[PDB]
């Protein structure tokens, strides 16, 4: 249904905020990228990298969690028979405190995710020990995919050639276990996509395109997502949000996640004051700064220009 | 007649539930692997004096009786002669077995018969008649009744895995068989769940025994 | 608008194994992996020493009331009992029992009990059965490593009466060629095929030039005994084996009744079987001393003795001694 459950009005503010926060909408770009990603996951076709770009807030993390959950439930009917068979593994890269990216931390965090026993103690049967342990764990536990969120933090190295050596280490990890690595990150992944033939052949590139204001179809889609967000806003009265579509697009750049968090802020502000409708000044209170929007627009424009290679 | 034998064991131990079919069958299969694959085998109900809580107190005449072809006894005798088994947390012991013949009688009886997909009494009578013709047997079908006269149903609780399934059956009394057909009935039986402690047929006096109480 | 509303709730998959679910190699064959080799393989797969993994996970489940972290900094013997140790851990001893139980619980696997002889507890006497020191066939290890195959120690190598590898016809070697010392089966770090002390190699093309026919019956019988346990599908019943032995004794007695000369060949085994049938049946029987010679004189393989039912065993015995009986 287009409307939120009607008994939520009588429920406290926390319940309404929860219903709004765990609610997510499927806009055409998100569902298309979801189908493409799962088609590539089901049939890797010899490609070991599924690099996914996107603006800050297009829904990369949400798509990652959705794919993890759906693959988990797809595999669920057979995990009772076969143990040590973790369906999917998804971890987030850590920006390094030091100047260069740390790989011991990466390996030990991956081991922590796989519930490896006695990680700290370890041994080297010959960070080589941690790398070998991760390789063996990936071989035996048999994960279907391996998401690595925030892949831009991989290239936190002062050496231009070691920038691709990070992916070389990841690739050497991948081959001896044959586990798909679908990295997710911002437009920074662009300097890692197709460097060298090894990363140019076995890498499939998916672009989480945002909703640009040029194509009338994308403008109509943005208006429709505004309409469905308005109809799913848990308020006593439904505020008219489609009219200020230009204002909503100005401070969100078409990023649906930005719209979601901004509307969450406005809804929480209204609920704290026990209001029944959303005013323009309510949106103006929690709108993003003009300089911030300019900076993210510059970044995504540069990323789109770089990715515009045909 | 003598071409089939009823293996009898003097059974002693703790008191036993009155719907103990799967319990004793599983215990016996635990202490006798070949029992799990045989075909023409069946177990007679275990006699005794019942209790108030739907449990049976084993007596001197209480005994485990197994119906088997005489050409398969050496596959069962090693694993049961003098052997003991556990039903849950209860210990049960079997003595040296003795052999009893398959005697014909004018009328027969079965304590519990189950055929898949038949719960009402009328269709149960029709199905028992169908199996009755399939064996080349002649007789009349009657259902043992409670004090109320209602046909008496008995229930078998198969506790397979975590779950447990319910199968309901009737007591069937068939008379006017002619001794050859009577023997054929006692040896074949009706219901199929003879390993499940149901389908064995007995002379008609035990029918009176069960109808009194 | 769009009516699709996704839900990202977790799915709560069943609990995963604490340790990797490594398959045991050649289960049901005369070359099954020993429990010690399986422990070392699991340790190698986890990039941990066998000792370290032991007190990391097996010790808290074995040693019930101790501080697990305080257990992490000890010697393997505190829980394994190196005062005994020996390749006899592969047998039917109590620590073997609890170790197998803990391992099967950790990986929720259902075949580790076949990697030992606890299925024959109360059936086969423990003494005079397993070597005190580690043994290996260098040809087997060299062939396995050259063929990029998994290195392991078969159960047969752990027995005193198995000294030769039928595949390579090579006498088992109990001493490391480099350090000159004899390896204990359990150690801090003893990967299969490696010298547990000097880390030297133990796989070389060693030729066996002895009379292997003398021990052939013993080694083949023990191999059949190991290979048959996983195929039974149940825990063996002691009186089943006792009554099979009694049936063989009756067949022997009938054969002697038909032919007097066979008494000269079978008197000692007749007396031994009679004693074994007069002593308590729950008492285990000496494998190599009693059962293997008994089935040998009966011209029956250990596989046939422990696998076939009473009807098949009786028929084959009657045919073997040309008796006219039919059970
Ligand atoms: N299509 C959507 N519908 C509803 N909420 C969304 C949608 N896409 C994103 N969100 C919201 O955005 C947040 C998740 O962050 P999001 O995926 O948008 O950021 P990202 O910049 O792409 O990722 P990251 O910064 O982790 O790389 C959550 O609050 C989620 O509810
Ligand atoms: Mg995010």
Automatic annotation (TrEMBL), chain A:
Binding site for Mg(2+) 1: 61
Binding residue positions for Mg(2+) 2: 61, 149
Residues where ATP 3 binds: 25, 27, 56-62, 198, 201-202, 260-261, 264
The organism's place on the tree of life at top rank: Bacteria
Binding, ATP 2: 24-25, 27, 56-62, 198, 201-202, 260-261, 264
Binding sites annotated in the UniProt record for Mg(2+) 4: 61, 150
Protein known as: Uncharacterized protein
Binding site for ATP 4: 25, 56-57, 59-61, 202
Keywords from the named record: ATP-binding, Metal-binding, Nucleotide-binding
Residues given in the record as Mg(2+) 3 binding sites: 61, 149-150
Annotated binding of ATP 1, by residue: 21, 24-25, 57-62, 260
UniProtKB/TrEMBL annotation, chain B:
Protein known as: Type I-MYXAN CRISPR-associated protein Cas6/Cmx6
Species annotation: Nostoc sp. 'Peltigera membranacea cyanobiont' 210A
Gene that this polypeptide is encoded by: cas6
TrEMBL record, chain C:
Listed name of the protein: Uncharacterized protein
């Amino acid at each position: 249904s287009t409307g939120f459950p009607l008994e939520l009005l009588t429920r406290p503010a926390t319940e309404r905020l929860a219903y709004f926060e765990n609610y997510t909408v499927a806009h055409p770009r998100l569902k298309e990228v979801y189908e493409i990603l799962m088609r590539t996951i089901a049939e890797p076709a010899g490609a070991s990298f599924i690099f996914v770009y996107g603006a800050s807030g297009v829904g990369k993390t949400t798509l990652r969690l959705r794919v993890e959950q759906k693959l988990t439930e797809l595999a669920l009917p057979k995990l009772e028979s076969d143990r040590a068979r973790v369906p999917v593994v998804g971890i987030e890269a850590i920006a390094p405190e030091s100047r260069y990216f740390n790989w011991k931390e990466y390996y030990t965090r991956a081991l922590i995710t796989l519930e490896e026993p006695l990680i700290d103690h370890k041994f080297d049967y010959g960070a080589p020990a941690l790398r070998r342990a991760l390789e063996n764990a990936l071989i035996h536990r048999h994960p279907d995919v391996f998401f690595v969120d925030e892949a831009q933090h991989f290239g936190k190295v002062a050496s231009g050639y070691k920038l691709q050596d990070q992916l070389d280490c990841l690739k050497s990890l991948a081959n001896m276990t044959g586990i798909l690595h679908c990295l997710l990150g911002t437009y920074e992944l662009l300097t890692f996509r197709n460097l060298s033939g090894q990363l140019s052949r076995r890498s499939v590139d998916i672009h989480f395109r945002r909703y640009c204001a040029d194509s009338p179809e994308d403008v109509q889609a943005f208006k429709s997502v505004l309409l469905t967000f308005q109809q799913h806003l848990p308020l006593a009265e439904t505020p008219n949000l489609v009219d200020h579509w230009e204002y909503f697009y100005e401070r969100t750049l078409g990023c649906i996640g930005t719209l979601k968090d901004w509307l969450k802020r406005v809804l929480s502000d209204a609920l704290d004051r026990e209001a029944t409708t959303i005013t323009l000044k309510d949106l103006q209170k929690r709108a993003l700064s003009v300089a911030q929007c300019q900076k993210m627009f510059k970044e995504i424009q540069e990323g789109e220009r770089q990715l515009s290679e045909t | 007649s003598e071409e089939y034998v009823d293996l009898t064991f003097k059974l002693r131990g703790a008191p036993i539930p009155l719907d103990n079919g799967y319990l004793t069958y599983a215990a016996l299969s635990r202490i006798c692997p070949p029992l799990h694959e045989l075909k023409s085998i069946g177990i007679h109900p275990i006699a005794g004096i019942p209790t108030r809580n739907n449990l049976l107190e084993l007596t001197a005449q209480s005994r485990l009786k197994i119906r088997i072809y005489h050409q398969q006894i050496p596959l069962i005798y090693p694993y049961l002669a003098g052997q003991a088994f556990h039903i849950g947390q209860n210990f049960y012991q079997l003595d040296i077995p003795d052999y009893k013949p398959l005697i014909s009688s004018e009328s027969v009886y079965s304590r519990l018969v189950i055929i898949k997909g038949f719960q009402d009494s009328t269709n149960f009578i029709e199905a028992v008649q169908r199996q009755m013709d399939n064996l080349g047997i002649q007789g009349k079908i009657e259902l043992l009744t409670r004090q109320d006269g209602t046909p008496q149903r008995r229930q078998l609780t198969i506790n397979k895995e975590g779950k447990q399934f319910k199968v309901r059956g009737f007591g069937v009394k068939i008379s006017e068989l002619n001794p050859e057909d009577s023997l054929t009935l006692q040896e074949q039986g009706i219901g199929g769940k003879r390993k499940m402690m149901c389908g064995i047929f007995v002379p008609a006096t035990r029918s009176k025994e069960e109808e009194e109480t | 608008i769009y009516s699709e509303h996704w839900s990202l709730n977790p799915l709560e998959i069943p609990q995963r194994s604490r340790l990797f679910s490594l398959e045991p190699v050649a289960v049901g064959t005369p070359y099954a992996e020993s429990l010690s080799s399986y422990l070392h393989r699991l340790a190698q797969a986890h990039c941990l020493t066998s000792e370290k993994l032991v007190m990391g996970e097996i010790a808290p489940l074995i040693l019930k009331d101790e501080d697990k972290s305080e257990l992490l900094s000890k010697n393997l013997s505190h829980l394994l009992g190196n005062s005994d140790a020996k390749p006899a851990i592969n047998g039917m001893r109590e620590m073997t029992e609890k170790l197998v139980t803990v391992l099967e619980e950790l990986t929720m696997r259902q075949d580790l009990r076949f990697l030992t002889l606890l299925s024959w507890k109360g059936m086969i006497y423990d003494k005079g059965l397993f070597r005190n020191y580690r043994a290996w066939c260098p040809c087997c290890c060299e062939e396995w490593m050259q063929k990029n195959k998994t290195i392991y120690e078969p159960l047969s190598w752990s027995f005193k009466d198995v000294e030769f590898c039928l595949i390579h016809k090579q006498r088992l070697i109990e001493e490391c060629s480099h350090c000159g010392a004899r390896l204990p089966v359990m150690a801090r770090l003893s990967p299969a095929g490696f010298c547990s002390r000097c880390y030297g190699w133990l796989g070389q093309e060693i030729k066996g030039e002895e009379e292997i026919e003398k021990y052939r019956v013993n080694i083949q019988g023990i191999s059949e005994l190991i290979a048959l346990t996983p195929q039974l599908g149940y825990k063996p019943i002691p009186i089943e084996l006792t009554r099979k032995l009694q049936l063989i004794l009756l067949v022997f007695e009938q054969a002697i009744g038909k032919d007097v000369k066979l008494l000269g060949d079978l008197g000692g085994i007749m007396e031994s079987l009679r004693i074994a049938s007069t002593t308590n049946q729950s008492q285990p029987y000496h494998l190599v001393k009693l059962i293997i010679p008994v089935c040998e004189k009966a011209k029956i393989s250990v596989f046939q003795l422990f696998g076939s039912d009473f009807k098949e065993l009786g028929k084959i015995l009657f045919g073997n001694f040309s008796l006219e009986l039919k059970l």
